[PDB]
């Protein structure tokens, strides 16, 4: 009675309410958490496998950026930028590494090149004096582990003690058979027994912020399951 | 064969204290192979490398249990092969004249040499070889 | 519940490391090795005949070198002593194809054969740059040895020293 | 003690001095020697071994061409050019087929347009009277083979008798398992049996000139071996 | 030293070679042969079931001639002499698409059966051109047979006929 199932970052098989999210800390950089998985109601248990089962992750950052009457067209970050899978033409990415919207003009803004490496991005448009512009670049120099709750706070540890980075995540791309994530680790959790996602970074993380364009959700996790129903 | 090793290790021993074998008693009339011991060393003028990336080799006719060394130039050596498993040896012009060896057998030969970094050549002058 | 794991653990390793080190480096300078890994204690590694690597050694200013450039991986007892007798990956770099040969199957550069090393024991990688270039610089690069995430690809095997009775053996061998 | 190995157009293994590069002849077309490589200090012997072993050869020739007031922008070559892998888009041809520099403007010239095999090229910018432009296009028709020396120049003979094209060598795509390269051979050398590549062909090679942009090496020659320590 | 090799080596034809031949060809002329390979003496040659082809025949302006374009080798016995007991790819033109075809194991056009040519016997390729289109040159055209120096395609082999004891039975065969 074992079927495989897909989790993610909102609700689906929780509800909203057995599964949050959350930021984290960055002026002490913390290994924080920034989503659960509570078991819900029903199951009898779930079961996580790396080297079988899969998983995606596409991690955004937020800003925010004025403009002038002689206006720049250029920005600088404090978040360091790689491509996804294979060159920076945002053209084909498989999905932008960033995103960029204007507030006063409620619109987007689309982008002309970027300073690759230098963590730098020119712009096609030119904003205006005290007009505000909201960023999306994707996240990157930062690590990530799992680890497990006993219904409480007592942590029975993690799964696989050795972290992974999160340019390496982007790097790899998703969606390809071989080429896809298989990590390390091998569990399992009853009702109630939480599983909390850890991260480890200086820079800030964006689930929402209701003027992202792109579909609500500024960012995501999605993962494979094996449950007993 | 149990005695004919003890006859060998007799023979050994008589050749290395030199006291029962009483070939000495007709060595000492003329020279012979017995008497002139074999090694190695170099004539008078001092042999020289000028160059590097460059690993001299010297093929010892024998084993050599000792060595000893002049020089005026601080250079590297190697008494197994500097390139495969060779530890580096260096040399300061100060402690030029030296050895090494005599209880501690080695059981060394077909030594390697190189020019280290300095302001001059290295010219060598060598004795080796009292096995 | 947690599922037991073995000694054995499948890792991929890179720049971001504690127990590895680096430094910027110079043209024409091929002795300095820009990367020094270096045997954590209690903790055997190992590769074998075949495992990726992610050369990444561009610019200052985000580039990679001239392709002229060579890179030499090279094996290293203690000492801080190269070593002939046991070395990997002698081969250019302007030829791996950056953006791709991290992902496919087949620009994946594996190396010349196996290798292990003790709880002390160090790696270095030499970078011949012909003459005249741009430096190096590492905050601006990258460099991996394996693919452990994916399921066509290698990985490194760690072990710790502890859960072992054949570690005298492979002391001896060093 | 068997390990596999690279050897380069430069240095590397030989200092510079245990290898030499060389141009060709060109007026009486002969199957001169470009490259060596002489066995340094150490090693016990080499091997090479076609249909086991690679190779990479990236030729180019040299010209100059001045300018004008009423600039052409255009140029003809009698130097037949090709792709590498595919199409002729200088985008995405693996590595340019033509490169090009003004000596006035220390400056790139870059490409618009390519007359394809009528060997005629078209540039997106505009030289100006007298001055000075270095080009390096691919060479191709011409021969290759190997050979060998006993110490002097008493040649043992060749390693495979029959010759190799380079329009074709650019033609078969390098960095693809399976679509490498594989001669056939199979050799060995002690110390100063050195080798000598060997090309026939119209055209000049060049390996150096102090101006090509490009990493002070304007071709190259490289390949694996098999050697004993 | 060199390496000992046997009489049968494995090799690639194409266009710039002394003993094969060409010409141009002109449209709606289907009998006027392009390529014209002919057995050297003392040489016999060898294709067996599939080999590579890449039969690139394209216009005075460097363009692959019309898709209706067909191509056919042909085999020939002396007395300049066509057979149909004998033939190996009939094939159209606008199908291989070239730039990658030389390349790839798939796009890979492999011949139909297996053919020997002793010391002089003929091989033909007909093209027959619909008519009314763009005529033939060789020069901005190329042709081959085999691949060598990779390690998944085919390739042809040759023998000298001084090296075999059997040569007179394959002298019956003809």
């Known amino acids: 009675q074992t079927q495989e199932y897909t989790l993610s970052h909102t609700g689906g098989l929780l509800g909203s309410s057995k599964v949050t999210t959350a930021s984290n800390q960055t002026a002490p950089q913390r290994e924080t958490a920034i989503i659960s998985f509570e078991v819900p109601r029903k199951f009898s248990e779930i079961e996580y ?126 969606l390809k058979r071989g080429r896809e994530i298989n990590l390390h680790g091998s569990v399992t959790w009853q009702e109630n027994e939480t599983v909390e996602v850890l991260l480890d970074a200086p820079q800030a993380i964006t689930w929402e912020d209701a003027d992202y364009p792109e579909g609500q959700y500024v960012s995501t996790f999605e993962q494979d399951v094996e449950i007993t129903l | ?93 100060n402690e030029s004249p030296f050895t090494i060896g005599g209880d501690a057998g080695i059981d060394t030969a077909f030594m390697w040499l190189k020019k280290a970094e300095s302001a001059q050549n290295d010219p060598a002058v060598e004795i080796i070889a009292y096995r | 519940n947690i599922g037991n794991l073995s000694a054995e653990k499948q890792i991929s390793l890179y720049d971001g490391q504690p127990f590895i080190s680096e430094q910027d480096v110079a043209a024409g300078d091929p002795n300095t090795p820009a990367l020094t890994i270096e045997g954590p204690d209690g903790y055997v590694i190992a590769v074998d005949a075949g495992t990726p690597i992610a050369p990444e050694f561009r610019d200052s200013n985000g580039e990679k070198l001239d392709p002229s450039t060579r890179v030499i991986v090279q094996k290293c007892d203690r000492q801080g002593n190269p070593l002939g007798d046991g070395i990997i990956f002698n081969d250019t770099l302007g030829r791996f194809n950056y953006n791709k040969m991290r992902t496919d199957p087949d620009y994946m550069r594996k190396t010349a054969k196996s290798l292990m090393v003790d709880e002390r024991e160090i790696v270095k990688v030499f970078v011949d740059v012909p003459d005249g270039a741009n430096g190096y610089d590492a905050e601006r690069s990258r460099f991996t040895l394996g693919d452990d995430t994916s399921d066509f690809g290698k990985a490194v095997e760690i072990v710790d020293h502890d859960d072992l009775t054949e570690g005298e053996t492979q002391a001896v061998k060093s």
Chains 1, 4 share one sequence.
């Not at chain 1, 920005?75 to 932008?96: S, T």
């Not at chain 1, 963590?119 to 096609?124: K, P, Q």
């Not at chain 1, 030119?126 to 512009?133: E, K, N, S």
């Open chain 1, 49 to 174: 496998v790396g080297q079988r089962d899969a998983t995606r992750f596409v991690p955004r950052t937020t800003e925010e950026i004025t403009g002038t009457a002689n206006d720049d067209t250029v920005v600088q970050l404090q978040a360091n930028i790689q491509p996804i899978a294979g060159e920076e033409d945002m053209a084909d990415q498989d999905y932008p590494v960033v995103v960029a919207y204007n507030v006063t003009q409620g619109a987007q803004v689309e982008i002309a090149d970027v300073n690759y490496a230098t963590d730098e991005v020119t712009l096609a448009t030119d904003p205006a004096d005290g007009d505000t512009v909201k960023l999306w670049p994707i996240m990157g120099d930062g690590e990530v582990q799992f680890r497990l709750v006993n219904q409480f706070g007592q942590e029975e540890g993690r799964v696989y003690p050795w972290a992974t980075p999160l340019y390496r995540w982007h790097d790899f791309p998703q």
């Open chain 2, 1 to 93: 064969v149990n005695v004919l090793e003890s006859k060998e290790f007799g023979g050994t021993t008589t050749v290395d204290k030199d006291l029962d074998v009483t070939k000495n008693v007709t060595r000492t009339d003329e020279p012979n192979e017995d008497n002139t011991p074999d090694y190695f060393s170099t004539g008078k003028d001092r042999v020289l490398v000028p160059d590097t990336e460059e690993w001299e080799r010297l093929g010892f006719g024998i084993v050599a249990k000792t060595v000893n060394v002049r020089t005026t130039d601080d250079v590297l050596l190697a008494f197994a092969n500097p390139n495969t498993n060779g530890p580096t040896f260096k040399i300061r012009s």
